[PDB]
Design an enzyme around this catalytic site. Structure first.
Site, PDB file in Angstrom:
ATOM      1  N   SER A  43     -51.839 126.746  39.695  1.00  0.00           N
ATOM      2  CA  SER A  43     -50.878 127.846  39.635  1.00  0.00           C
ATOM      3  C   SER A  43     -49.841 127.838  40.744  1.00  0.00           C
ATOM      4  CB  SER A  43     -51.583 129.206  39.655  1.00  0.00           C
ATOM      5  OG  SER A  43     -52.125 129.466  38.376  1.00  0.00           O
ATOM      6  N   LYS A  46     -46.274 127.738  39.602  1.00  0.00           N
ATOM      7  CA  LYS A  46     -45.525 128.884  39.091  1.00  0.00           C
ATOM      8  C   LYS A  46     -44.346 129.216  39.984  1.00  0.00           C
ATOM      9  CE  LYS A  46     -49.528 130.562  36.586  1.00  0.00           C
ATOM     10  NZ  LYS A  46     -50.859 131.170  36.695  1.00  0.00           N
ATOM     11  N   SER A 103     -50.593 135.624  38.992  1.00  0.00           N
ATOM     12  CA  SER A 103     -50.950 134.317  38.451  1.00  0.00           C
ATOM     13  C   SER A 103     -51.159 134.389  36.940  1.00  0.00           C
ATOM     14  CB  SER A 103     -52.178 133.739  39.163  1.00  0.00           C
ATOM     15  OG  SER A 103     -51.987 132.346  39.352  1.00  0.00           O
ATOM     16  N   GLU A 139     -49.648 126.060  30.539  1.00  0.00           N
ATOM     17  CA  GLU A 139     -50.934 126.701  30.774  1.00  0.00           C
ATOM     18  C   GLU A 139     -51.744 126.731  29.481  1.00  0.00           C
ATOM     19  OE1 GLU A 139     -52.175 127.498  33.522  1.00  0.00           O
ATOM     20  OE2 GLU A 139     -50.529 127.834  34.937  1.00  0.00           O
ATOM     21  N   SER A 210     -55.751 127.653  41.427  1.00  0.00           N
ATOM     22  CA  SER A 210     -57.121 127.204  41.300  1.00  0.00           C
ATOM     23  C   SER A 210     -57.260 126.512  39.958  1.00  0.00           C
ATOM     24  CB  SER A 210     -58.118 128.355  41.445  1.00  0.00           C
ATOM     25  OG  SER A 210     -57.980 129.265  40.379  1.00  0.00           O
TER      26      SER A 210
END
Length: 260
Positions: A43, A46, A103, A139, A210
């Protein structure tokens, strides 16, 4: 140096692979540990998607207010904010904030779609001089963190330099840079990572990440009280696919860096 001895010992005690890059903007010195090895971004990627959309808004002044429909089919594995707006809309600003501060993976996928796919996020990295960052997947598969897989990786050195440019440099326009900094400072997921190793008086803006293989990441811009800001990237990944996250390792790395 002394810091690198301690980071290597931290790494040895952890059983994983640790990557650290610090940029001290006071003298543009860097402290690197595995600074040129690739790590899965998870993440932390992002930040680049949000920055890319911010860059678009320098020309399309109303872009951040554009409503984007959240449909049930859009939801993936972790959508704490998008789930609150299913069958409604969120603006691109709201999606960027959700991606960064919570996230939210659906938010990330909408940002990627806005940029024309992962290739559009990577394009923005190239446009600001980051030749290392690569986003290959959306994702949630970008988090597979398979050892040796170059997809969806960057290096600590590259990410530190890019985060510096986005937040303290001038890769973005002034209003866009301030918005990015405000979003990062309002992150809600970082309390146990870099922030936990730093004096409570220092202001931190960060983005955690993570993934599989116990991948535990945090990238941060740090404003110490009465001192030039720092940029700190901490990437950590482990040999076992099901390994648990190790945010304490990032906290300890930050503490070791802050000792210097």
């Amino acid at each position: 140096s002394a810091v690198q001895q301690k980071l290597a010992a931290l790494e040895k005690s952890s059983g994983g692979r640790l990557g650290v890059a610090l940029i001290d903007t006071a003298d543009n010195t860097q402290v690197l540990y595995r600074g040129d090895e690739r790590f899965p971004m998870c993440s932390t990627s992002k930040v680049m998607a949000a920055a890319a959309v911010l860059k678009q808004s320098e020309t399309q002044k109303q872009l951040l207010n554009q409503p984007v429909e959240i449909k049930p089919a859009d939801l993936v594995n972790y959508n704490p904010i998008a789930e609150k707006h299913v069958n409604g809309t969120m603006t691109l600003a709201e999606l960027s904030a959700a991606a960064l501060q919570y996230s939210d993976n659906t938010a990330m996928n909408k940002l990627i779609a806005q940029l024309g796919g992962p290739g559009g996020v990577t394009a923005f990295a190239r446009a600001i001089g980051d030749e290392t960052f690569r986003l290959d997947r959306t994702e949630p598969t970008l988090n597979t963190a398979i050892p040796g897989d170059p997809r969806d990786t960057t290096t600590p050195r590259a990410m530190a330099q890019t985060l510096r440019q986005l937040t303290l440099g001038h890769a973005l326009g002034e209003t866009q840079r301030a918005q990015l900094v405000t979003w990062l400072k309002g992150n809600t997921t970082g309390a146990a990572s870099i922030r936990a190793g730093l004096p409570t008086s220092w202001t931190v803006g960060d983005k955690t990440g993570s993934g599989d293989y116990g991948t535990t990441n945090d990238i941060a811009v740090i404003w110490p009280q009465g001192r030039a800001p720092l940029v700190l990237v901490t990437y950590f990944t482990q040999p076992q696919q099901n390994a648990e996250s190790r945010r304490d390792v990032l906290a300890s790395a930050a503490r070791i860096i802050a000792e210097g």
